[PDB]
Design an enzyme around this catalytic site. Sequence first.
Site, PDB file in Angstrom:
ATOM      1  N   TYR C 133       0.843  -1.194   0.000  1.00 20.87           N
ATOM      2  CA  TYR C 133       0.000   0.000   0.000  1.00 20.87           C
ATOM      3  C   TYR C 133       0.876   1.241   0.000  1.00 20.87           C
ATOM      4  CZ  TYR C 133      -3.265   3.651   1.416  1.00 20.87           C
ATOM      5  OH  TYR C 133      -4.051   4.773   1.462  1.00 20.87           O
ATOM      6  N   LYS C 161      -0.833  -1.011  -4.448  1.00 18.05           N
ATOM      7  CA  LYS C 161      -2.042  -0.200  -4.560  1.00 18.05           C
ATOM      8  C   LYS C 161      -1.689   1.207  -4.115  1.00 18.05           C
ATOM      9  CE  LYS C 161      -6.635   0.680  -2.731  1.00 18.05           C
ATOM     10  NZ  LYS C 161      -6.333   1.902  -1.951  1.00 18.05           N
TER      11      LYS C 161
END
Lengths: 290, 291, 288, 288
Positions: C133, C161
């Site tokens: 992330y 992401k």
Amino acid sequence: DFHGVFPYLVSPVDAEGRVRADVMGRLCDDLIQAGVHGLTPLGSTGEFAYLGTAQREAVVRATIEAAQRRVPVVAGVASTSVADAVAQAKLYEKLGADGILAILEAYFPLKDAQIESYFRAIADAVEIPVVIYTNPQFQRSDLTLDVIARLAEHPRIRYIKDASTNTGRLLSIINRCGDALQVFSASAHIPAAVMLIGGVGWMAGPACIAPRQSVALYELCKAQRWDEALMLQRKLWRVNEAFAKFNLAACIKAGLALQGYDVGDPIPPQAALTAEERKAVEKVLAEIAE
Amino acid sequence: LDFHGVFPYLVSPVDAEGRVRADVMGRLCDDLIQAGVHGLTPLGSTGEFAYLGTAQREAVVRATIEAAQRRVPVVAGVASTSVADAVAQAKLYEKLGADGILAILEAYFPLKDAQIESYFRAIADAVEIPVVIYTNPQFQRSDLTLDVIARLAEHPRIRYIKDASTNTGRLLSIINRCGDALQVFSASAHIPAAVMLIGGVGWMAGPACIAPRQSVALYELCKAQRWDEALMLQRKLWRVNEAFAKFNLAACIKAGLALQGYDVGDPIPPQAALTAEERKAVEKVLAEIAE
Amino acid sequence: DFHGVFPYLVSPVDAEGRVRADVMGRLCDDLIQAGVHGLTPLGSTGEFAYLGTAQREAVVRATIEAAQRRVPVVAGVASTSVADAVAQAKLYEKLGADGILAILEAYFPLKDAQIESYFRAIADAVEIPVVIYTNPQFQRSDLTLDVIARLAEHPRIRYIKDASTNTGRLLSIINRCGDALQVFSASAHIPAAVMLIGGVGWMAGPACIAPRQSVALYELCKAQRWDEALMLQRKLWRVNEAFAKFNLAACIKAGLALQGYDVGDPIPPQAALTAEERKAVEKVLAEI
Amino acid sequence: DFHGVFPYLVSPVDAEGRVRADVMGRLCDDLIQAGVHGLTPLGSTGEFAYLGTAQREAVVRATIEAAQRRVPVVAGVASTSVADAVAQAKLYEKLGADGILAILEAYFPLKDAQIESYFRAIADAVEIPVVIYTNPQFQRSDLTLDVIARLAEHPRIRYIKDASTNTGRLLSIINRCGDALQVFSASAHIPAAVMLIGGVGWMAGPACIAPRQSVALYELCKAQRWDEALMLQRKLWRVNEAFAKFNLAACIKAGLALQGYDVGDPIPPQAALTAEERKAVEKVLAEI
């Protein structure tokens, strides 16, 4: 040597942007008569960021003429480039300025070497003392303790004025440079605390509307009469807290107007304080009026 | 007729004394036009407007207009902290022959929306040529909200907006909100292909100076919806953006143009020119995209 | 391989903080029937920052049980310490998660080597895939392209992401890592633009309230039917601007409540949307 | 009433996260013996951000048992949710804490009304005094003067500790609240200046490695012997400067280790100081 209270003079202009030398003259004369220890035109409160080449010169010329060598006149020199800053410094020195408040404005990021070359260039351009301006909280490119230390090695760079709220930063500068660099603060710092830790004075916009009280505070601190200094500091701090919400240039211009000075309004797009906001300035002023 | 396509953010050629090199600017603009660019934008960030005085700025815009010979529109960047100064600049460039104004708001003290709005309307009201609103909330001290942008679009002269931030999603919100009333231009922080996909009309960027034909080719592929080919090319041109990203863009493009034979000079001190080692890194990317 | 639409599930709880496993189950089941390609519990929208260890386990467990292996469940692992993160990752893997969304929270600043060590530790603790992330615009300690490239070399770090608005950064990642690191975006990036440049899907809160439309958008992009994709994208993008000034978790919970899901309110101090603010949710939903 | 020097205790743990009560006890004992006026476990320097619920309880318990009521123990309570903060506060009070240092951690932005509700909930959960923690320069959600003034109205919110560098705001607070909110500062503020403007003391990590000097500085200021206090302040400030580039928890732990305390290293991903960095810590400790 520069010390005490240097009011950051507002720059009086009319609707067309023409500098009001006459208004600036009586203001400067009154401030000097109130006992201020110096004058600083073209500081942030002076809206240097909104005035062109001609307007800045006019502001500086009017200040120098009104002061008549009574107190030192330190002129703000702000620029993004070396050539422009050098031109300004040389000009203000030529007009009669006693010192230069060197301000670096940055667009593209600059490495420490480049930042240093700017200030060094201004100092090498004149024979009058230079006061380095610094505010890590607002400026895009500012000075590290190391850069400051290296600059203090220049014969004519002997002062620094920090406008951030980081007073601890000031103590580090003094511990590092000692007397090679005398420290000035701004309204973001508590004057009494700045004087307690070794500062020599302050350049601030509010000093324009409370010159005698500011000088009194300075004197009390110098005399080490701390209890009396703090009484006064609390009252004057309340003044800053009230201003700490408005555009400071617009704030002082409103206050000076309430005191009879036809300083006019800030340069558009800045807005002048509204009747309601002005009423608030009026109340804080009346509370410390002597 | 409307502004569209690739508008290079021209560098500002000057000597060590700071004098604009009109002749060098002339050959550059002439070469960019022959390369097919759709417009020219002097005094953008890449043009070092923040480092040039009113006299140098006029010299730049003058040199660009003369060189263009109305072959492509010239959009002059007008940057200032005051309405008076901005108005004076805009009227001056319009008089000199500019086809549009890229309105840039510089701020010192914070401004409320009404004041920010007053600045742009003052410029739009001062001229008859189109105004391109400049925006980059990631760098500018005082920028524009979508509501202010929407209100500004209601002015008959404010017809374009150019965003230099990396926030492409904001461009789509602006398009959904203003539609054709405000045609969108991006800068190099946005992926050109993505901007064209969502509705932009083109871009104004510094890299376009060193890769004009490839930029134009990318624009056409996107316009023709040849996305596979557009992206093959986009991935290549992005590597160029990624390489410059670690440098002062103006310093980068100036060093890049020098490598291509343009004696554009160095950035205005205290800015530093790229070092020999940095210039090799730039010569590297150029070689890879050279056609 | 993970792809498509992964809703950032809200974490339904009662005023006492007890997870409503029953409501979570119906929500997950409905989303799966809507065609979503995966589920992601404990992402920002799932209020991971406000849930304790037990609450987090309850949420993940509820999601896995309801999924019934129909789509991968990627569990968010957020922590400031290696030991705690490893403990969470090993627990979620044991419960049956198909992947781990590794989130580094920082207090004191960290050098790249320490940041890299946090992600490698999570990856070395499990056998399931790790999704890194990243959001430089919000995270105190984030990732540089150089660090991302080195992390991509780990056999189990296969995805990343990005929740920032910087879509250009995504293309740089793809040019540098290729298929060694497949990219997922969040609601801050325009979905169609991400797919155009090579992304594989997105994990976001808005998917919870508009699953079918989100899935349709993904399919149109994959089929390269850009004209139709954009028409739909323009409509769906309204959700982002409508929730721009509000707590995203508050918005999705309000929206889900309007759709019939008793998901409860955000965990205090967070406030649920006021009646006035909820009008924006009613509006954008009717519009979609 | 809380006053003087409150060392921000480091949290000693082994490589496996187990708190070393024996170590903490020996450290607290020597601090009290050194003259400190209080002890503050779980402060920033105590790595509260890297400690779980169990570890935090161990730290608090180990500090209270060691203090033997010789000096007040103010326990740091940090959380993103009301439920967790209230639980912590109630637990620490139950363990024997004398005060709570309420720290609001935020993820999603919070309006003033919500920020205020967080602190009031904590204050409503215990009978012991509450010290409001603030640092606008690091915290995602902090307090305005208005909010601070409102909180000061709470019968048990009687102190505030500011860790920013903005000393000017301490005076603004003192002018507005006065006796209602006694002010404590941290390393970022110059102790002498804080005492000059009306503060009552400070809570900082450096007090761990220089307690006797820190206490001396305090007494000098209280005695209004400003010349001597400033000479001492300049020296102790060299300490603040030296760590300026490091993780404060790592510096204090390294410094204590050099002084004979087996406090261990910071919790990974944080890194302990290298040798080159410890030598630096050695020099500053020698200077005074």
